[PDB]
Ligand binder design. Structure first.
Ligand SMILES: c1ccc(-c2n[nH]cc2-c2ccnc3ccccc23)nc1
Ligand SMILES: [Cl-]
Ligand SMILES: [Cl-]
Length: 306
C-alpha cells in the first residue's frame, strides 16, 4: 500500500541509505513529517533493526530524532524517524566549501554535545562525517540546529551497568570514511571515545580550510590509498593544518589525539576551548550560521542549491 507501518504515507524519495533508499512521508494521524528508510530483509548485512534500538536507547537526547516505528513490510524492514533537513556537507557545498570561523565554532560545540550524549549512552559512533549531521526543517524550532543520524556503525564501548570499558585490540577492519577517520582507525586499532572526537577535529579543519591535505591522494587500491591518507595524517602537524586559523583548533586535535584509549574526554573543556575562539575574535555565539544567508537571506533552496 501507499501507507506503511499503519500510519505513515509514503512520499517522494529523498536519499539513499546504506542498502535501501529513504523516502519522506507523513503520519496520516497528525500530519507530522517523517523519514522512512528501507532495508531488504534478506540482505547480507543487517543494521536497520540495530539502528532502531539505538534510536530508542537515545530517545530524548536533543538533536537525535525520535524513532516512531520499525517493522516488516513485505520484503523489507522499515524504520520511520523524524524528517530532517540538509546535511552539513550539503550546506558546506552550497556555501562555497568554506565555513566562517564563527559557524565552525558554533557547529563544533553542537557536534561535541551530540557525540557526548552518544558516549553517555555507552556507544561510540565510529562513522563521523559532515554528511551524517543534518539541520532541521524550514520554519521548525530546530531549523538551524545540528542533528545526528545513521547509527549503523555504532557499537557499545563499555558495559552499561559496570561501565567496564571494552579491551584494546588491534587488527580491526578499516571500516569508516578515510577523509575523517582517526589515525588509530587507519592502524586497525579498536576505536574508543577519543576516535570519534579526533574525527570531529578533522571535520572542523575541513570546514575551516575547505579541504584537508590528504584529499586527492592516489594509489592503485583502496587499501593502499587509506594507508597513504593515514601516513599524511601522521606526518602533518596540527599547527600546520591550522595555518592562519585560530590555534584552539590545533590544540583541540592534539589533545584528542593524546587521549588514552579508555579515557573519558573532557567534553566541556573542549567546548570552552573552541568558544574562546569567539572571545578572541570579538564574536558572539548567537546562532547565526553561514547557510542562513544563502539566496538573499531566504536560506538554502531546492532550485538554486539542492
Ligand atoms: C530512518 C529514516 C532515515 C534515516 C536516514 N539515514 N541517513 C539519513 C537519514 C535521514 C533522516 C532524517 N531526515 C532525512 C532527510 C533527508 C535525507 C535523509 C534523512 N535513517 C533512518
Ligand atoms: Cl565491531
Ligand atoms: Cl580524496
Amino acid at each position: 500500500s501507499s501507507v506503511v507501518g499503519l500510519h505513515y504515507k509514503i512520499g517522494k524519495k529523498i536519499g539513499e541509505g546504506s542498502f535501501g533508499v529513504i523516502f519522506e512521508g507523513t503520519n496520516i494521524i497528525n500530519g507530522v513529517p517523517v523519514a522512512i528508510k528501507f532495508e531488504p530483509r534478506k540482505t547480507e548485512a543487517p543494521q536497520l533493526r540495530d539502528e532502531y534500538r539505538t534510536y530508542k536507547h537515545l530517545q530524548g537526547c536533543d538533536g537525535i530524532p525520535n524513532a516512531y516505528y520499525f517493522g516488516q513490510e513485505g520484503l523489507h524492514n522499515i524504520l520511520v524517524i523524524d524528517l530532517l533537513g540538509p546535511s552539513l556537507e550539503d550546506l558546506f557545498d552550497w556555501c562555497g566549501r568554506r565555513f566562517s570561523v564563527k559557524t565552525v565554532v558554533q557547529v563544533a560545540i553542537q557536534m561535541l554535545t551530540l557525540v557526548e550524549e552518544v558516549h553517555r549512552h555507552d556507544l561510540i559512533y565510529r562513522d563521523i562525517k559532515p554528511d551524517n549531521f543534518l539541520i532541521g526543517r524550514r520554519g521548525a524550532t530546530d531549523e538551524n540546529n545540528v542533528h545526528l543520524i545513521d547509527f549503523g556503525m555504532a557499537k557499545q564501548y563499555r558495559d552499561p551497568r559496570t561501565k567496564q570499558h571494552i579491551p584494546y585490540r588491534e587488527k580491526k577492519s578499516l571500516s569508516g570514511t578515510a577523509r575523517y577517520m582517526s589515525i588509530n582507525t587507519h592502524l586497525g586499532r579498536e576505536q574508543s571515545r577519543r576516535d570519534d572526537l579526533e574525527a570531529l577535529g578533522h571535520v572542523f579543519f575541513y570546514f575551516l580550510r575547505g579541504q584537508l591535505p590528504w584529499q586527492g591522494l592516489k594509489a592503485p587500491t583502496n587499501k593502499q590509498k587509506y594507508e597513504k591518507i593515514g601516513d599524511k595524517k601522521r606526518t602533518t602537524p596540527a599547527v600546520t593544518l591550522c595555518d592562519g586559523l585560530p590555534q584552539q583548533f590545533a590544540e583541540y586535535l592534539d589533545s584528542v589525539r593524546s587521549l588514552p584509549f579508555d579515557a573519558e574526554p573532557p567534553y566541556e573543556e573542549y567546548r570552552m576551548l573552541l568558544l574562546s575562539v569567539l572571545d578572541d575574535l570579538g564574536q558572539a555565539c548567537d546562532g547565526d550560521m553561514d547557510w542562513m544567508h544563502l539566496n538573499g537571506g531566504r536560506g538554502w533552496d531546492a532550485t538554486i542549491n539542492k
